[PDB]
Amino acid sequence: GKIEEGKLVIWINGDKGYNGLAEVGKKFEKDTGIKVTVEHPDKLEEKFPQVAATGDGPDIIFWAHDRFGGYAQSGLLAEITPDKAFQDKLYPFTWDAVRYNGKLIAYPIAVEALSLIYNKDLLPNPPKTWEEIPALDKELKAKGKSALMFNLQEPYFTWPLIAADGGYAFKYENYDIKDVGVDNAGAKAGLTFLVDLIKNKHMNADTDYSIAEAAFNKGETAMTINGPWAWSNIDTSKVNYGVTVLPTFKGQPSKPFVGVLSAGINAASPNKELAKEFLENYLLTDEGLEAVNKDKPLGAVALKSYEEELAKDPRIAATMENAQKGEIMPNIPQMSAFWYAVRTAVINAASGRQTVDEALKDAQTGSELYRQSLEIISRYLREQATGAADTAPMGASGATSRKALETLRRVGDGVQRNHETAFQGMLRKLDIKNEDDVKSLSRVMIHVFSDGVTNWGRIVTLISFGAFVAKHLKTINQESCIEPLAESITDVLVRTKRDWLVKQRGWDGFVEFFHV
Ligand SMILES: OC[C@H]1O[C@H](O[C@H]2[C@H](O)[C@@H](O)[C@@H](O)O[C@@H]2CO)[C@H](O)[C@@H](O)[C@@H]1O
Ligand SMILES: C=Cc1ccc(C(=O)O)c(NS(=O)(=O)c2ccccc2)c1
Ligand SMILES: [Mg+2]
């Protein structure tokens, strides 16, 4: 492989305590003579899948648990195997956070939740509601202060307001992944409130992490919204601060997405046993977690013994209070796509580039794109291969899925007829005989669909070849390969054609384009 044997490379995000982590690395090095290198690459959560897909990158990757499902789904992570005794050392619900398709795919480290951080000298009694913040800002502006500044470039920080009055990502009721609440009335109310803060000069659409942090730590703004990792810098600034429950919106609690900081092991690492040793017997201990925490606070750690100490901290009690009012992030593979969609929506709404209504509409479509495409393509491939339709209800957004499939059947019939010779030739050239061969199609399909003008014609041709291949797989008693084929084609489609698909209003555009 490309990853070096007999050493550890560890990537962690730039806002975390990577110097403290490096100290843990140093102790491991001292014991074993094996080098540990910690890096905090820019755009880490995008850089990791890029390099890991080529079999490269770090042995150990740190991020909140939400990204790890996509990584696991892409074959980038080793299954991890803590023995029973080690597992019992961490809270069961943190392990739940790192389970994907019934397998553990990461070590959970700490539970992160946003809180309201406030300056006790400017604001001894922080607002219980978002609604009183405009008036508070007007008072403070008379003194050359502002009420509130927080990062407007990452949706994570605005989500708690979006979800307060009813917005949600993927319906969690004891998951309906088809049920997406990104553009419902509650989500629009929350984002509209944020946009009005900006229009009324109570916030600035350009504000990012660095700018908000600096304004709070310099005592220019009375409040910020941030996580435990930020407390270290505030301590240094000597601002007299407090950490408390987020304001309510429309009488409802703000609901932060709760993240579990987690460490995965690169599927292509030759050092998996070393990584296991490092994570289990050096990092996930009282002294290991302490060393990181003293650099930048981790939040509420997954390790029972050490959390029992940290829980006495009023800042941590506050973190857990907010965490309990929020929801643990899903780790389904399309979480990245969801975050990309909401990110664009908040940025576009805040800048006036789009209205709130249209911005969230696009985020809705972007977030729904994977599951809806998979439903359409899976159903088409399966019915094409068996000759009979699936009579199960389509579920949520059923009209769209049903009409798209009806359109695909009609248009797809002609494409397959006209491409029969081409399809037969390409099938024989590719030699698809089993689930292993199916795995090899992804790189091929990506290369083809990363170039050229996009249109519905070319998309239908791909799905039609999918159906052709599915029929073949059925015929040679490899009917079990059809669903991973459908998943792979869907994955290539929504990845390479994301922006174009959203601009078409997803499959609704497809239906309209081939209307009769
Ligand atoms: O903004 C979208 C972003 O939200 C979360 O990322 C957090 C991360 O969990 C925290 O540890 C901290 O570093 O701030 C990040 C936001 O800037 C999700 O984990 C992430 O996947 C998502 O893109
Ligand atoms: C799924 C594998 C695969 C491989 C190669 C191509 C290609 O166009 O070169 C392709 N694109 S296509 O589906 O539109 C196609 C075009 C002609 C013949 C067969 C498939 C799909
Ligand atoms: Mg639109």
End-to-end C-alpha distance for the chain, whole angstroms: 53
Amino acid at 156: Y
- Tell me, using a 6 A CB cutoff, whether residue 462 lines ligand 2: yes
Spacing, Cα 462 to ligand 2 middle (Å): 6
Give residue 179's identity as a one-letter amino acid code: D
CATH number of the CATH domain containing 480: 1.10.437.10
CA distance 119 to 243: 9
Nearest-CA residue for atom 19 of ligand 2: 423
Separation between Cα atoms, residue 342 and residue 187, nearest integer Å: 11
Dihedral angle of Cα 158, 163, 168, 171, to the nearest 10 degrees:
140
**Taking each helix axis from N to C terminus, what angle separates 18-32 and 286-293, rounded to the nearest 10 degrees?**
140
- E runs forming strands in 42-95: 60-64
Smallest CA-to-CA distance from 272 within 100, 101, 60, 484 is with 60
CA dist 313 and 332 (Å) reads 33
Q: Name the one residue in this structure whose structure tokens are 């389970």.
A: 99
Distance CA 229, CA 63 (A): 13
What is the CA(217)–ligand 2 centre distance, in A?
A: 56
Give the bridge partners for 63, in sequence order.
262
Q: Which of 421, 442, 445 to mutate to test the pocket of ligand 2 (most atoms within 8 A of CB)?
A: 445
Statement to judge: residues 403 and 508 lie in one domain: yes
In the numeric block, the tokens 């100490």 are attached to 309
| Residues 341 and 452 reside in one and the same domain | yes
Please, what is the Cα angle at 63 between 106 and 9, to 5 degrees? 80
**252-284 residues labelled b (16+ CB within 10 A) or e (exposed):** ebbbbbbbbbbbbbbbbbebbebbbbbbbebbb
Contact 78, 287 (CB under 8 A): no
For residue 198, give the CATH number of its domain: 3.40.190.10
Using what technique was this structure determined?
X-ray
**Side chain identity at residue 105, one-letter code:** I
- Looking at the structure, do residues 220 and 349 belong to the same domain, yes or no? no
Cβ atoms of 52 and 267 closer than 8 Å? yes
User: Which helix (H) or strand (E) is 479 found in, with range?
Assistant: none
User: Which tokens belong to 340?
Assistant: 């990309």
Question: Which atom of ligand 2 sits closest to the CA of residue 427?
Answer: 19
Quick count: other Cβ atoms within 10 Å of Cβ 34?
16
| Strand segments (E) across 85-231 | 99-100, 103-104, 107-112, 115-119, 146-148, 168-171, 176-181, 221-226
**Side chain identity, residue 157:** F
Backbone angles phi, psi at 203, to 5 degrees: -150, 170
How many CB atoms are located within 10 Å of the residue 304 CB?
12
Q: Which ligand is nearest to the CA of 359?
A: 3
Q: Tokens for 283, please give them.
A: 């990092």
Distance CA 18, CA 73 (A): 27
The four Cα atoms 375, 377, 380, 385 give a dihedral, to 10 degrees, of -110
Residue nearest to atom 17 of ligand 1 (CA): 154
**At a CB cut-off of 8 Å and minimum separation 6, what does 66 contact?**
257, 259, 329, 330, 331, 335, 339
Measured on CA atoms in the order 427, 433, 436, 438, is the torsion positive or negative?
positive
**178 CA distance to ligand 1 middle (Å):** 23
Residue nearest to atom 13 of ligand 1 (CA): 15
156 CB near ligand 1 (under 6 Å): yes
CA 303, CA 276: separation in Å to the nearest integer?
Answer: 16
| 101 three-state secondary structure | coil
Q: Whose CA is nearest to atom 3 of ligand 1?
A: 156
CA pair distance 111, 306, nearest whole angstrom: 13
Atom of ligand 2 nearest to the CA of 430: 4
As to burial, measured by CB atoms within 10 angstroms (0-12 exposed, 13-18 middle, 19+ buried), residue 92 is: exposed
CB 26, CB 20: distance < 8 Å: no
Does the beta carbon of 266 lie inside 6 Å of ligand 1? no
Residues 158 and 248 in one domain: yes
Q: Which ligand sits nearest to residue 360's alpha carbon?
A: 3
Residues 496, 14, 87: CA angle, nearest 5 degrees = 85
CB 474 within 8 A of CB 386: yes
What tokens appear for 216 in the block?
Answer: 């709070």
Cα–ligand 3 centroid distance for 320 (angstroms): 37
The alpha carbon of 387 and the centre of ligand 3 are apart by a number of angstroms equal to 36
* Two structure tokens written together for 401: 């899925």
Query: Do residues 222 and 146 make contact, with C-beta atoms less than 8 angstroms apart?
Result: yes
Query: Which single residue is written with the structure tokens 């899925």?
Result: 401
Q: Could you tell me if the CB of 449 is within 6 A of ligand 2? A: no
Ligand 1 close to Cβ of residue 213 (< 6 A): no
Which ligand 2 atom is nearest residue 462's CA?
13
Q: Verify that 366 and 474 share a domain, yes or no.
A: yes
Q: Which atom of ligand 2 is nearest to the CA of 489?
A: 1
* CA separation for the pair 360, 456 (Å, rounded): 24
Question: 459 Cβ partners below 8 Å, 6+ apart?
Answer: 493, 497, 510
Q: Does the Cβ of 259 fall within 6 Å of ligand 1?
A: yes
Residue 303's DSSP bridge partners are 90
d(CA 449, CA 255): 39
Check whether residue 244 and residue 362 sit in a common domain: no
* 328 Cα–ligand 3 center, Å: 29
Task: List the residue whose alpha carbon is closest to atom 14 of ligand 1.
Answer: 156
Minimum-distance ligand to the CA of 461?
A: 2
Q: How many alpha carbons fall within 13 Å on the CB side of residue 165? A: 21
Residue with tokens 């407390």: 231
Range of the domain at 394: 334-514
